[PDB]
Amino acid sequence: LYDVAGSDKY
Amino acid sequence: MTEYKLVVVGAVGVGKSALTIQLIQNHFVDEYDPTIEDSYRKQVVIDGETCLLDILDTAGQEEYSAMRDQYMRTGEGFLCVFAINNTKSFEDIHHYREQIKRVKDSEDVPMVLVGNKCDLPSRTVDTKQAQDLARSYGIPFIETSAKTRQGVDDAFYTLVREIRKHKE
Ligand SMILES: Nc1nc2c(ncn2[C@@H]2O[C@H](COP(=O)(O)OP(=O)(O)O)[C@@H](O)[C@H]2O)c(=O)[nH]1
Ligand SMILES: [Mg+2]
């Protein structure tokens, strides 16, 4: 779930 | 030679990967694949001791990794990292600390609470509030910026220091 947002956030 | 097995955890976007790379390779990556869990090694000196850091930069994903489990079973210290401009990442810290307590079956795991991105003006998680949290855990709290390298060495080296203390 690091995998997807990445540089952003969630 | 003495090895320190560390695990960098935290919500996505907080800067786990940037902190590790700017420690291991002394540069600030603009973008580092969201999907990538990888371990990083390097020989450093901490308080005049030449040792080897073996760091797992976690990705948090479902697919089974024997290595991840290897780092959870044998990892000695942890960085619980959030961004000071990301309130939701600070609210996520407890979940990771509870996980870690589960893996070691101990409320006393050497840990360091890190607020990354101290170079940014927009600050929603203030120092005292992060100091309140670190004090309720019993752990050091360190302010870092993987961008300008501020606090980057202290965060990891304080973790190694918490590991030495637990080791006696
Ligand atoms: N302003 C600022 N940006 C950062 C810092 N550290 C990392 N970044 C940027 O944050 C983004 C995402 O962090 P990343 O390295 O991918 O770590 P992740 O949250 O574990 O995915 C990338 O754009 C980095 O270049 C920092 O300390 N300050
Ligand atoms: Mg990462």
Author numbering:
A (entry chain D): 65 to 74
B (entry chain A): 1 to 168
What did the original publication write about this model?
Finally, we successfully obtained the crystal of KRAS G12V-H-REV107 peptide (65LYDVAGSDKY74) complex and determined it at 2.3 Å resolution by the molecular replacement method using the coordinates of our KRAS G12V structure. The H-REV107 peptide was bound to one molecule per four molecules of the KRAS G12V with a solvent content of 47% per asymmetric unit. This structure comprises residues 1–168 of KRAS, 4 MgGDP, and 83 water molecules with an H-REV107 of 10-mer peptide. Notably, the H-REV107 peptide was strongly docking in close proximity to the switch I and II binding pockets and the near P-loop of KRAS G12V. The hydroxyl group of the H-REV107 peptide Y66 strongly bound to S17, D33, and A59 via hydrogen bonds, and interacted with the phosphate binding P-loop, and switch I and II regions. Charged H-REV107 peptide D67 also interacted with P34 and T35 in the switch I region, while charged H-REV107 peptide K73 interacted strongly with KRAS N85. Notably, the catalytic domain of KRAS around G12V on the P-loop region was surrounded by the H-REV107 peptide in the wide binding pocket, and D67 of the H-REV107 peptide penetrated deeply into the hole between the switch I and II pockets. In the H-REV107 peptide complex, the switch I region including P34 and T35 and the switch II region including Q61 were more open when compared to the form in the KRAS G12V MgGDP. The structure of the KRAS G12V-H-REV107 peptide was found to be an opened conformation with an inactive GDP-bound state, and large conformational changes were shown at the regions of switch I (T35) and switch II loops (aa 60–74). As indicated by the structures of the KRAS G12V and H-REV107 peptide complex, the binding of H-REV107 peptide moves the switch I and II regions even further away and interferes with GTP binding itself.
The small GTPase RAS proteins operate as “molecular switches” that fluctuate between inactive and active states. These switches can be activated by the exchange of guanosine triphosphate (GTP) for guanosine diphosphate (GDP), which is promoted by guanine nucleotide exchange factors (GEFs). The H-REV107 gene is a known member of the class II tumor suppressor gene family that has been identified as a growth inhibitory RAS target capable of suppressing anchorage independent growth in vitro an in vivo. Here, we found direct interaction and inhibition between KRAS G12V and novel H-REV107 peptide.
